[PDB]
Write a protein that binds this ligand. Sequence first.
Ligand SMILES: CCCCn1c(-c2c(C)ccc3[nH]ncc23)cn2c3c(=O)[nH]c(=O)n(C)c3nc12
Length: 275
Amino acid sequence: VHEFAKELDATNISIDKVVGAGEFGEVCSGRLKLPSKKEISVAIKTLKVGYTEKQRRDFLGEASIMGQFDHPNIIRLEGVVTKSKPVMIVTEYMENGSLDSFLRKHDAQFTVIQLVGMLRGIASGMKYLSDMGYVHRDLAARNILINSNLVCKVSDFGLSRVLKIPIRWTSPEAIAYRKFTSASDVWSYGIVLWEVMSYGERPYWEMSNQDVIKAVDEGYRLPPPMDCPAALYQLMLDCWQKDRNNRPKFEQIVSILDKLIRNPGSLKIITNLLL
Ligand SMILES: CCCCn1c(-c2c(C)ccc3[nH]ncc23)cn2c3c(=O)[nH]c(=O)n(C)c3nc12
C-alpha cells in the first residue's frame, strides 16, 4: 500500500468538519500542511473504530489504486495515515461534492457548453484510467466529484480492477456474464452523459432491476433528456451500442467533446424507453 501511497504525519492534518459517512467510516474536510509548508484543503476518509482486518485491507486498497493515477481529472490522493488511529485516506478537496447531487440543485441552470466541459473532464480522466489498464466498473454521476471551478474528477475505486454491481450503469454483456472491459466503462460513461444532461435524474428512474436488464437487452434505451443537443444524444447511443466493439474509445469521446466545445453552433440541433 505504501508503494503508491505516502504515509502522512497526523500532526500535519487538521480536521475542520464531518461532511459525510462512507462505506468504511466518516468523511470529513480539513487541511493538510505539505512539506513545503503550503496548506491545502483536503477531504479525509476515516476508517471506523472497531474495524476488522479485512475492512482495513479493503479501505486502504482503494488508496493503492488511487495512488497509481496522477491526472487532473482523477481524484488526487495526498496520502494515508496508518501508523496512528484512526486510519485515514486523504485526497484533494472537491467543494461542490458529488456531480449528481450537485446537478440536482441546479436543474437547467447551466449552459450546454458548461455541461460539455464537465463531460470532457470525466472522459479525459476515463481515457487515462483505461490507458493504465483499469476497469472502473462503477462509473456513475454519484462517483464523480466536482470542484469550485466545475472541474470534474473520477473517484471511488472500490469496485475497480486491473484488466454488488450497479445494474443501471453496467453494460448488457457485463450484466450477462461479467464481461468487464474498457468498452463496458464506455457504456457507463453513456449513462453518466445521460445523467449530466438530465441534471441528476436517476437512470431508468425506479424501474425494477429485472426490467432494466430485459429492456436494455431488447434494445430499448433511455430517451433524450429535455432540450438535449442531438450531437450529445447520439453520443449516448454510440456509447450504448449492443456490440461492444462498436462503441467509441474514450480517446474518441474526448475528441468529440473537444470539437463540441469549439463550435457551440453544433449544439443547436435539439432532439419511457426508446427502441
Ligand atoms: C466519491 C466520494 C467519496 C468520498 N470522498 C472523497 C474520497 C476520499 C477522502 C478518499 C478516497 C476516495 N475515493 N473516492 C472518493 C474518495 C473525497 N471527497 C469529497 C470532497 O473532497 N469534497 C466533498 O464535498 N465531498 C462530498 C467529498 N466526498 C469525498
